[PDB]
Amino acid sequence: DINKLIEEGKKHYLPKTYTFDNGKIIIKAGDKVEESKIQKLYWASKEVKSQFHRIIGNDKPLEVGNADDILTIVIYNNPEEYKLNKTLYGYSVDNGGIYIEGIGTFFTYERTPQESIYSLEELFRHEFTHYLQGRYLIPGLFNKGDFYKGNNGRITWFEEGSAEFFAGSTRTSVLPRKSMVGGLSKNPKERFNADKLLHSKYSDGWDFYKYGYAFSDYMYNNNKKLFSDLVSTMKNNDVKGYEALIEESSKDSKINKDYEYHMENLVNNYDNYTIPLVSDDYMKQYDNKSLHEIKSDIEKAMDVKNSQITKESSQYFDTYNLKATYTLSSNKGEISNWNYMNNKINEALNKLDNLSWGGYKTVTAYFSNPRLNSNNEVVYDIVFHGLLSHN
Ligand SMILES: [Ca+2]
Ligand SMILES: [Zn+2]
C-alpha cells in the first residue's frame, strides 16, 4: 500500500516523538532538532495560551469533537527537509510554517539565524496561536466557517496580525517582538494605515503581517475595547457585527492616528526590545512539592477557595492544572474589570515567584468566561498551570 510507503518516509525524516499533557500534544521531530529546545516549546505554548485566554476571554472549545482536541506538531531538521512535507503530508511549503486546523497539526522546521530572521520558538509561538484561534476563537474550520465564506479574506489581517502579536507572550504580558518591530518601515509615510491593514489578504503579500502585528499591539496597549469587541463577534460567529466593526474602525481617523502614533513609539523603542523566549527556569530540577501544598499557596496567592487541582503527565515531567472561580466584588465595566483581573492574576504569579520553591517560576495563569451570577456579580473562571516535577 502507498500509505505504508509514506509513513516510512515520515519515520525516516521524523523519527523522534515527544508527548505532553496525557497525549494531548504530540511533537514529531527530526533527529537533529534538540530535545531541550522541544521541551522549551511546550512551555512557550503555555505562555501564549494563558495570554491568549486572558485577552480572548474564552477557554472552552467552540466545537467539541474536532481534530484539534489533540495538537500534533511536526518539526523538520532544516528548511531543505521541510520541503518534503508537501509529498509526505500534502501541504504547501512556501512559508516558515503552516497550521492545518482540519487535522489539528502544525508543521515547521528548525533553522539557523542565517536561514531566517525568526527563531524556531518564534515561529512555533506564531503557529500555536493559529491553533488557539481555530479552537477557541473562530467557529467552523479554516476557510470553511462563516467568517471565511463570502469574503474569504475578511478576518485575515487579524488572524495573522494577532498570531504575530501573541508570539510575544510572557508569563505576565504580551511584549513587543524585535523581529516584528524591525520589520516596520522607518519612514512613517510608508507604513500601512488602518483601512489598508483591515482589508489586507494573503494575495497582497507578507507586509500586512507586520502592520497587523503592530495594530494588535496598539489595541492591546491603547484600545482594549476594540480588541474585546472584535473577539466577541468572532466567538459569536457574528460576521455582520465584525464587518460593521471593521468599517467603523477603518474610517475612524482617530483610530488611524493613534495606530500610527503607536507604531512610531514601537519603532522608537526598537533597541529596547528583544525576542521573547522561554527562560531556563522551565528546565531546572526543583525540590518535590506536594500538590496539596501547591494548591494552598495558589489559593492564598490568588485569594480563591475550594479550587480543584489535577496532575497531568508528560514524557519527561508532570504538571498540574488548578481550576478555580473568582467573584469580582465590584463590576466596573468590561475593560476596567479586565485590567483588575489581569493585574490580580499577575500579582498572584509574582507572590508565588517570591516564594522559596523554584517551581513557581514555571507557572502561567489566566482568567476567562466572565458571567453574572444571581446577585449581579462578575464570576471568572481561573486557571493556573505549572510544573509539578521532572522525572
Ligand atoms: Ca475553528
Ligand atoms: Zn500565520
Numbering used by the authors: 340 to 730
Please quote the authors directly:
Clostridial collagenases are among the most efficient enzymes to degrade by far the most predominant protein in the biosphere. Clostridia employ collagenases for nutrition (e.g. saprophytic strains) and host colonization (1–3). They are large multidomain proteins of ∼115 kDa belonging to the gluzincin superfamily of metalloproteases. Here we present the crystal structures of the peptidase domains of ColH and ColT and the collagenase unit of ColG in the presence and absence of the peptidic inhibitor isoamylphosphonyl-Gly-Pro-Ala bound to the active site.
As described analogously for ColG, inhibitor binding induced a 2-Å contraction of these segments in ColT. This conformational breathing emphasizes the hingelike active site topology in clostridial collagenases. Although all peptidases adopted an open conformation in the unliganded apo-form and a more compact conformation in the complexed state, this breathing movement was most pronounced in ColG and least pronounced in ColH. Notably, the peptidase domain of ColG from C. histolyticum showed a higher structural similarity to ColT from C. tetani than to ColH from C. histolyticum. This structural relation is in particular evidenced by the extent of peptidase half-domain motions accompanying inhibitor binding and may, on a functional level, reflect the substrate specificities of the three homologous collagenases. The interaction areas between the inhibitor isoamylphosphonyl-GPA with the individual enzymes is largest in ColH (256 Å2) > ColT (248 Å2) > ColG (220 Å2), as calculated using the PISA server. The characteristic HEXXH consensus sequence is located on the central helix; the third proteinaceous zinc ligand is a glutamate located 28 residues (ColG and ColH) or 30 residues (ColT) downstream on the neighboring gluzincin helix. The spatial arrangement of the zinc ligands is identical in all three peptidases, notwithstanding the difference in sequential separation.
